[PDB]
Amino acid sequence: HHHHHHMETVLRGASMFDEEHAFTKTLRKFEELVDEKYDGDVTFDLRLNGELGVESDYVTFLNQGVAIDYTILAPSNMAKFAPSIPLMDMPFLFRDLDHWNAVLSSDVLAPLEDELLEKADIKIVGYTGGGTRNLLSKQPVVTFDDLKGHKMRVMGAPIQAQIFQALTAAPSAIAYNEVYNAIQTGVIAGFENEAASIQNLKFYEVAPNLTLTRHSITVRPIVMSGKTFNSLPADLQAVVLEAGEEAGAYGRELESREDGVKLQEMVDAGQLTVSEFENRDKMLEMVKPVQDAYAAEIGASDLLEAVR
Numbered sequence: 314h315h316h317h318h319h320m321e322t323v324l325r326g327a328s329m330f331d332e333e334h335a336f337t338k339t340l341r342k343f344e345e346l347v348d349e350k351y352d353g354d355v356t357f358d359l360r361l362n363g364e365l366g367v368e369s370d371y372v373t374f375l376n377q378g379v380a381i382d383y384t385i386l387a388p389s390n391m392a393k394f395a396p397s398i399p400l401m402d403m404p405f406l407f408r409d410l411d412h413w414n415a416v417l418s419s420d421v422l423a424p425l426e427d428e429l430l431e432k433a434d435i436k437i438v439g440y441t442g443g444g445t446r447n448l449l450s451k452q453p454v455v456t457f458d459d460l461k462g463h464k465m466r467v468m469g470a471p472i473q474a475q476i477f478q479a480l481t482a483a484p485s486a487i488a489y490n491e492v493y494n495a496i497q498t499g500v501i502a503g504f505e506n507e508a509a510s511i512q513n514l515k516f517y518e519v520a521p522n523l524t525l526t527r528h529s530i531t532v533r534p535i536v537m538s539g540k541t542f543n544s545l546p547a548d549l550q551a552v553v554l555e556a557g558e559e560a561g562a563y564g565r566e567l568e569s570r571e572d573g574v575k576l577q578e579m580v581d582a583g584q585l586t587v588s589e590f591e592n593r594d595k596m597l598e599m600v601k602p603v604q605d606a607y608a609a610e611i612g613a614s615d616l617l618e619a620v621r
């Protein structure tokens with residue numbers, strides 16, 4: 314029971330997935346690298362399989378500085394604590410992987426890291442992600458006629474609902490751990506997610522029809538509570554930032570390389586049917602007003618123009 318005051322220091326992590334998912338692997342890499350790098354003693358306790366809840370729970374735990382010390386979070390699950398951060402990977406922000414990589418290779422997102430630390434007391438220590446989010450539905454959704462009134466779950470950040478509303482869908486901010494039942498029960502017709510998570514949590518079992526809208530390439534900060542990070546000795550702080558940066562690089566190389574491979578695994582196994590969306594690129598014009606308005610409201614117009 315007896316730990317070092319800021320014998321050993323124990324850092325508690327959370328993941329929604331098992332050991333086979335890129336986020337869990339990224340967190341294990343983080344732990345490995347801190348151990349390699351730190352001339353000192355630290356113990357990591359990673360609680361997997363959503364034992365400690367979902368991201369919407371984790372973010373409040375980190376803001377409070379209790380329960381868990383580190384995890385990975387989607388920007389669009391952080392909006393209640395930092396209204397600007399969902400800009401980081403909002404729908405249709407990135408053109409392709411090359412664009413996404415150019416961003417993560419800079420420090421252009423810095424203003425958003427700063428807001429998260431200031432407003433939410435959550436420290437970004439690296440960036441993983443690299444999955445491509447597509448529509449996943451009970452029945453095929455392949456035209457704008459199909460999309461009109463399409464009931465779908467979105468993450469809670471306002472920008473998510475605003476985007477899909479502009480595409481004429483009917484979004485619903487339903488908890489991630491309630492999606493499978495909500496589809497199975499017909500409350501909604503589908504949701505949207507990347508390959509790795511669809512496969513790992515078996516969402517194809519209730520929603521076997523995937524539409525290649527390719528509307529998000531994920532940016533997934535590796536995060537530590539500000540309360541924990543700021544308490545750590547100065548040398549361990551610096552190690553955590555180095556390990557986080559390297560773990561993020563590892564995780565996003567991993568997920569981005571495996572995304573298409575996993576779509577193919579699910580097709581080959583008869584689990585998914587994959588279809589293109591007719592006139593998909595019309596989507597880009599339709600969502601531009603919503604993107605611009607959001608950026609303007611949070612005073613991030615210049616940040617968005619740079620990214621584009």
Ligand SMILES: O=C(O)[C@H]1O[C@H](O)[C@@H](O)[C@@H](O)[C@@H]1O
Nearest residue numbers: 368386387390468489506510
């Ligand atoms: O849609 C979601 O809530 C989740 O989807 C996927 O599991 C991941 O991108 C995760 O970071 C998100 O929180």
